[PDB]
Design a protein around this ligand. Sequence first.
Ligand SMILES: [Cl-]
Ligand SMILES: [Cl-]
Ligand SMILES: [Cl-]
Ligand SMILES: [Cl-]
Ligand SMILES: [Cl-]
Ligand SMILES: [Cl-]
Ligand SMILES: [Cl-]
Ligand SMILES: [Cl-]
Ligand SMILES: [Cl-]
Ligand SMILES: [Cl-]
Ligand SMILES: [Cl-]
Ligand SMILES: [Cl-]
Ligand SMILES: [Cl-]
Ligand SMILES: [Cl-]
Ligand SMILES: [Cl-]
Ligand SMILES: [Cl-]
Ligand SMILES: [Cl-]
Ligand SMILES: [Cl-]
Ligand SMILES: [Cl-]
Ligand SMILES: [Cl-]
Ligand SMILES: [Cl-]
Ligand SMILES: [Cl-]
Ligand SMILES: [Cl-]
Ligand SMILES: [Cl-]
Ligand SMILES: [Cl-]
Ligand SMILES: [Cl-]
Ligand SMILES: [Cl-]
Ligand SMILES: [Cl-]
Ligand SMILES: [Cl-]
Ligand SMILES: [Cl-]
Ligand SMILES: [Cl-]
Ligand SMILES: [Cl-]
Ligand SMILES: [Cl-]
Ligand SMILES: [Cl-]
Ligand SMILES: [Cl-]
Ligand SMILES: [Cl-]
Ligand SMILES: [Cl-]
Ligand SMILES: [Cl-]
Ligand SMILES: [Cl-]
Ligand SMILES: [Cl-]
Ligand SMILES: [Cl-]
Ligand SMILES: [Cl-]
Ligand SMILES: [Cl-]
Ligand SMILES: [Fe+3]
Ligand SMILES: [Fe+3]
Ligand SMILES: [Fe+3]
Ligand SMILES: [Fe+3]
Ligand SMILES: [Fe+3]
Ligand SMILES: [Fe+3]
Ligand SMILES: [Fe+3]
Ligand SMILES: [Mg+2]
Ligand SMILES: [Mg+2]
Ligand SMILES: [Mg+2]
Ligand SMILES: [Mg+2]
Ligand SMILES: [Mg+2]
Ligand SMILES: [Mg+2]
Ligand SMILES: [Mg+2]
Ligand SMILES: [Mg+2]
Ligand SMILES: [Mg+2]
Ligand SMILES: [Mg+2]
Ligand SMILES: [Mg+2]
Ligand SMILES: [Mg+2]
Ligand SMILES: [Mg+2]
Ligand SMILES: [Mg+2]
Ligand SMILES: [Mg+2]
Ligand SMILES: [Mg+2]
Ligand SMILES: [Mg+2]
Ligand SMILES: [Mg+2]
Ligand SMILES: [Mg+2]
Ligand SMILES: [Mg+2]
Ligand SMILES: [Mg+2]
Ligand SMILES: [Mg+2]
Ligand SMILES: [Mg+2]
Ligand SMILES: [Mg+2]
Ligand SMILES: [Mg+2]
Ligand SMILES: [Mg+2]
Ligand SMILES: [Mg+2]
Ligand SMILES: [Mg+2]
Ligand SMILES: [Mg+2]
Ligand SMILES: [Mg+2]
Ligand SMILES: [Mg+2]
Ligand SMILES: [Mg+2]
Ligand SMILES: [Mg+2]
Ligand SMILES: [Mg+2]
Ligand SMILES: [Mg+2]
Ligand SMILES: [Mg+2]
Ligand SMILES: [Mg+2]
Ligand SMILES: [Mg+2]
Ligand SMILES: [Mg+2]
Ligand SMILES: [Mg+2]
Ligand SMILES: [Mg+2]
Ligand SMILES: [Mg+2]
Ligand SMILES: [Mg+2]
Ligand SMILES: [Mg+2]
Lengths: 174, 174, 174, 174, 174, 174
Amino acid sequence: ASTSQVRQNYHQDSEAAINRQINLELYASYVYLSMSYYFDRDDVALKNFAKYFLHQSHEEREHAEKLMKLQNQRGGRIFLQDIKKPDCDDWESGLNAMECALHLEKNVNQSLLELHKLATDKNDPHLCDFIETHYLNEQVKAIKELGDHVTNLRKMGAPESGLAEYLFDKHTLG
Amino acid sequence: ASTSQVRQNYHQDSEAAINRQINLELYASYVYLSMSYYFDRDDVALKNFAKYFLHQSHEEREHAEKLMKLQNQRGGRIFLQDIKKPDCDDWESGLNAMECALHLEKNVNQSLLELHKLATDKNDPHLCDFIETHYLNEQVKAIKELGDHVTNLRKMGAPESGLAEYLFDKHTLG
Amino acid sequence: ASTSQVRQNYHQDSEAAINRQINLELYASYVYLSMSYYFDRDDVALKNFAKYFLHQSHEEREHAEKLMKLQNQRGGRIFLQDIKKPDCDDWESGLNAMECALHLEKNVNQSLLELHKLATDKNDPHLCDFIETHYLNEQVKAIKELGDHVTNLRKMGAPESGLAEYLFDKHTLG
Amino acid sequence: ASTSQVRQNYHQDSEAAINRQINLELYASYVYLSMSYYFDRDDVALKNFAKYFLHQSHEEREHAEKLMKLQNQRGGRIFLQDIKKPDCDDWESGLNAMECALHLEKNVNQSLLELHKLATDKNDPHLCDFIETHYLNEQVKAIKELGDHVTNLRKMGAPESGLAEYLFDKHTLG
Amino acid sequence: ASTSQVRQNYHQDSEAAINRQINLELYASYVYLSMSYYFDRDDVALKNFAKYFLHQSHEEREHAEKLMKLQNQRGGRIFLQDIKKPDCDDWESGLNAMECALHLEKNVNQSLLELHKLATDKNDPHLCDFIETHYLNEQVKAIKELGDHVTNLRKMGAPESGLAEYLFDKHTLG
Amino acid sequence: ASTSQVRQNYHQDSEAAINRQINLELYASYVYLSMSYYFDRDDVALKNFAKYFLHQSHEEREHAEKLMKLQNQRGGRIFLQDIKKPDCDDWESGLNAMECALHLEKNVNQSLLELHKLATDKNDPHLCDFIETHYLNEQVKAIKELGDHVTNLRKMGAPESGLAEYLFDKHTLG
Ligand SMILES: [Cl-]
Ligand SMILES: [Cl-]
Ligand SMILES: [Cl-]
Ligand SMILES: [Cl-]
Ligand SMILES: [Cl-]
Ligand SMILES: [Cl-]
Ligand SMILES: [Cl-]
Ligand SMILES: [Cl-]
Ligand SMILES: [Cl-]
Ligand SMILES: [Cl-]
Ligand SMILES: [Cl-]
Ligand SMILES: [Cl-]
Ligand SMILES: [Cl-]
Ligand SMILES: [Cl-]
Ligand SMILES: [Cl-]
Ligand SMILES: [Cl-]
Ligand SMILES: [Cl-]
Ligand SMILES: [Cl-]
Ligand SMILES: [Cl-]
Ligand SMILES: [Cl-]
Ligand SMILES: [Cl-]
Ligand SMILES: [Cl-]
Ligand SMILES: [Cl-]
Ligand SMILES: [Cl-]
Ligand SMILES: [Cl-]
Ligand SMILES: [Cl-]
Ligand SMILES: [Cl-]
Ligand SMILES: [Cl-]
Ligand SMILES: [Cl-]
Ligand SMILES: [Cl-]
Ligand SMILES: [Cl-]
Ligand SMILES: [Cl-]
Ligand SMILES: [Cl-]
Ligand SMILES: [Cl-]
Ligand SMILES: [Cl-]
Ligand SMILES: [Cl-]
Ligand SMILES: [Cl-]
Ligand SMILES: [Cl-]
Ligand SMILES: [Cl-]
Ligand SMILES: [Cl-]
Ligand SMILES: [Cl-]
Ligand SMILES: [Cl-]
Ligand SMILES: [Cl-]
Ligand SMILES: [Fe+3]
Ligand SMILES: [Fe+3]
Ligand SMILES: [Fe+3]
Ligand SMILES: [Fe+3]
Ligand SMILES: [Fe+3]
Ligand SMILES: [Fe+3]
Ligand SMILES: [Fe+3]
Ligand SMILES: [Mg+2]
Ligand SMILES: [Mg+2]
Ligand SMILES: [Mg+2]
Ligand SMILES: [Mg+2]
Ligand SMILES: [Mg+2]
Ligand SMILES: [Mg+2]
Ligand SMILES: [Mg+2]
Ligand SMILES: [Mg+2]
Ligand SMILES: [Mg+2]
Ligand SMILES: [Mg+2]
Ligand SMILES: [Mg+2]
Ligand SMILES: [Mg+2]
Ligand SMILES: [Mg+2]
Ligand SMILES: [Mg+2]
Ligand SMILES: [Mg+2]
Ligand SMILES: [Mg+2]
Ligand SMILES: [Mg+2]
Ligand SMILES: [Mg+2]
Ligand SMILES: [Mg+2]
Ligand SMILES: [Mg+2]
Ligand SMILES: [Mg+2]
Ligand SMILES: [Mg+2]
Ligand SMILES: [Mg+2]
Ligand SMILES: [Mg+2]
Ligand SMILES: [Mg+2]
Ligand SMILES: [Mg+2]
Ligand SMILES: [Mg+2]
Ligand SMILES: [Mg+2]
Ligand SMILES: [Mg+2]
Ligand SMILES: [Mg+2]
Ligand SMILES: [Mg+2]
Ligand SMILES: [Mg+2]
Ligand SMILES: [Mg+2]
Ligand SMILES: [Mg+2]
Ligand SMILES: [Mg+2]
Ligand SMILES: [Mg+2]
Ligand SMILES: [Mg+2]
Ligand SMILES: [Mg+2]
Ligand SMILES: [Mg+2]
Ligand SMILES: [Mg+2]
Ligand SMILES: [Mg+2]
Ligand SMILES: [Mg+2]
Ligand SMILES: [Mg+2]
Ligand SMILES: [Mg+2]
């Protein structure tokens, strides 16, 4: 029951919201892992799409670990939940995977914006600064990058043009 | 429906057993992640226990990735399931965590031995060699290491001796 | 007549099966040599297809040499047969050559799997280990690579698109 | 009485067979030590024969140590027996010593093949892989090398030609 | 049917004669491969004879490849035939193998001299220069080397003297 | 029967005493090998005790080899006997093993002192110098080191204190 010796200005609602965000980052890690190995299939065979999404996957795990570190720094207690399987097994195309990644990153951003609103409501400037420093601009850059990629693949003629996804794999992701 | 152009001598039962093993490796990764951050709590504060279990966690993710690579190499299709949360939130002590890790690694080994029996039953010598090369001796070394650690912590007087877990953290894990 | 001073646990059927496999590896070497120089024709002119298949050809010769070394290591006696000319003089296209190479590598794999079954039947664990160590995973990687290449060429629009085979030559094989 | 915390899938018969093999490797070490110092006698005086057999002797000790390490890795218990003196004090000639070494290495190989059959019978794929990885191909190479040496010494005119054993000592073992 | 865009002054008889020579070079490659592994037998065991003939074998493959390159350079079309097994399985002795290699190299030279006569008859100075530059002096050097080796082995007392072949292996081929 | 051409001032009793000492050094090597792998057990798990005794074991083998070299230098003839298994399978504790090693080294020293008395009685100053140079001060240093180790382990509270043996392993043997 008794309070952590380190805990100060750290609301129970913020503690719970941080545990929810840890789960979402691990979910995103899992989604990108699934997408990566789709592109390693012998009937898809786009190795730089596979490498790009595997790197994305490793970055999400790092995002989760930093939130776990934060939870302990502030004297909250980590509570883990199941990591749900991704919505899709078959990602259809390079373009569709990039569109799904854009959607994932905007949903993660919306979660972080809700987290920041809560930290603002509870007058937790350390937690506001943590989210702003480590997460919000990373999300803005990730979303911009994925939008750029979706744009190029559409302009090149994906997903009908297998030549488009092949040349994008070599010139943008390679 | 139609068969992968690469698939040869790769039974549907082996394909399914590989997907089950991918889930178990990701589960083990999650268990070690949970254990790691327990030792980063301000009321536990054993930083080399935390580092040791985080490294274990990263190794399990690599074990899962190599099985995903194998699935595609042989022309099977990855099917992911939810990654269950670990059995414990509170791991009690350095000794208890090490005993739980020993139990986890023996359960993963038993799964791999069942997988090898199936590959033997289906006359899949490539899959037998894959399991023997990349997994069986890694498990034997992991189990031996964890047994050694449990032995030292017990002999030192853990878990009642907080001095024992502190000195083990510095001299064996540091 | 009299037995080799080194021979131990090496069945006459295994000895004969090794000589058959030596011939098949030299045949595969010859098939890839033929394919290589097709791409060096002035009316085909895909230099990285030519280089890729020449390297394949040199690797098959190395596969044959290692089996010849094995035969002598175990005290069997090499018996050579004619190396048959390849089935084709004209390989039609980059895509068709890659499809023929995939077929060749799956036939060589099937031969090696029959060889392993025989070594298992004759309780020859050294020969089983030799095949697993030096051949089975090399075949699995070769087949996966060729499947990936066939997939990309088809998606790019080969064989009708001469642009597809030209750009594949530069970006994947170059 | 109670079971090792590490032990899994490790039959008592395999444990005993490993202890027998440890003794045989130490015996082989002793045989090669005896042979080495025969060639250091002032009335034999073949220094590269002496060096060759001393290196052989050190390799057998390493073979024994790795089996001792395996016994503990799998949670079996080492049981040592007397190391019998070699069959001979006087090895007669370079050729006779090489013929005795060929016989020793084939007997050690036969022991390892019996060990592998037992591990196969007890469905111990880790132990099968251990024997295949560390022992079976080392034996095949050792036996082939000794056969080659016996062949050269016989062709040169040993053991009647002291010139043959002298020139072999310099050109093959030196 | 229609003519290569590159073809100029290249008679159909020269084109056919080049295909015959490609087969003979691949045959010679095969003969030297067979001879090499004879010397790797445990009951022959002359490792520098084995290395010498393996290098010879690799040089013949290079001779064949350069003729394949020539065929395409001049706009002819490669036509491959079966590579016949060597005349012998058992080469008897170092001296006999060297005598067989001398005979092989003189037969290859006679083929090249017939090829040059044809190129002269068809007023093909490029093909005459190609044969003179890349083949005729290589044959003269190869034949002289093999004659020197046969001479030394005979003078040393081969094939009855196993000491002769052993010392030649070390001092000339080593 | 007839005498070695090198033999001078080398009594048959000294020759026999040297063969007895060769056996005792090989016995000591075996005792330290057994002790080493006791500390590699998963239920003992003191890796620097294991390393220390393995090094001791290798030093005893070197002691035996130097006596074998001496036997031949002086024109005596090596006669080997069985190497008896150690008195213990289970060495109980770090302290007990160190006490057993102290006892072993004092027994080996007593043997060497008897050997020196015999060499003195037979007026063999070369053999006296050999024993003094290579053995007597090595024994005195070994005995002093083991006494120091026994003293520290007792003062630290071994064998009841598992913490004592763990910290000794790290700070003295590590
Ligand atoms: Cl608070
Ligand atoms: Cl609160
Ligand atoms: Cl990464
Ligand atoms: Cl605030
Ligand atoms: Cl940023
Ligand atoms: Cl940006
Ligand atoms: Cl920015
Ligand atoms: Cl391009
Ligand atoms: Cl299949
Ligand atoms: Cl199936
Ligand atoms: Cl790591
Ligand atoms: Cl099988
Ligand atoms: Cl391993
Ligand atoms: Cl280990
Ligand atoms: Cl190991
Ligand atoms: Cl046999
Ligand atoms: Cl047979
Ligand atoms: Cl190459
Ligand atoms: Cl078997
Ligand atoms: Cl491989
Ligand atoms: Cl691969
Ligand atoms: Cl691989
Ligand atoms: Cl068991
Ligand atoms: Cl049992
Ligand atoms: Cl050595
Ligand atoms: Cl098995
Ligand atoms: Cl090996
Ligand atoms: Cl070999
Ligand atoms: Cl080898
Ligand atoms: Cl023309
Ligand atoms: Cl013409
Ligand atoms: Cl070469
Ligand atoms: Cl002319
Ligand atoms: Cl030249
Ligand atoms: Cl010359
Ligand atoms: Cl010249
Ligand atoms: Cl004397
Ligand atoms: Cl005397
Ligand atoms: Cl050492
Ligand atoms: Cl004296
Ligand atoms: Cl000293
Ligand atoms: Cl001292
Ligand atoms: Cl001193
Ligand atoms: Fe994230
Ligand atoms: Fe794992
Ligand atoms: Fe300390
Ligand atoms: Fe091959
Ligand atoms: Fe051995
Ligand atoms: Fe040639
Ligand atoms: Fe000693
Ligand atoms: Mg959620
Ligand atoms: Mg990202
Ligand atoms: Mg709480
Ligand atoms: Mg669900
Ligand atoms: Mg989507
Ligand atoms: Mg910033
Ligand atoms: Mg950052
Ligand atoms: Mg499961
Ligand atoms: Mg691990
Ligand atoms: Mg399916
Ligand atoms: Mg649940
Ligand atoms: Mg537990
Ligand atoms: Mg291994
Ligand atoms: Mg590995
Ligand atoms: Mg065939
Ligand atoms: Mg290949
Ligand atoms: Mg035969
Ligand atoms: Mg035909
Ligand atoms: Mg085909
Ligand atoms: Mg096997
Ligand atoms: Mg392998
Ligand atoms: Mg290889
Ligand atoms: Mg025995
Ligand atoms: Mg050896
Ligand atoms: Mg027992
Ligand atoms: Mg006896
Ligand atoms: Mg003998
Ligand atoms: Mg191997
Ligand atoms: Mg080894
Ligand atoms: Mg011909
Ligand atoms: Mg030549
Ligand atoms: Mg034509
Ligand atoms: Mg014929
Ligand atoms: Mg001939
Ligand atoms: Mg010239
Ligand atoms: Mg040249
Ligand atoms: Mg004694
Ligand atoms: Mg000592
Ligand atoms: Mg005597
Ligand atoms: Mg006894
Ligand atoms: Mg004792
Ligand atoms: Mg004195
Ligand atoms: Mg001194
Ligand atoms: Mg000394």
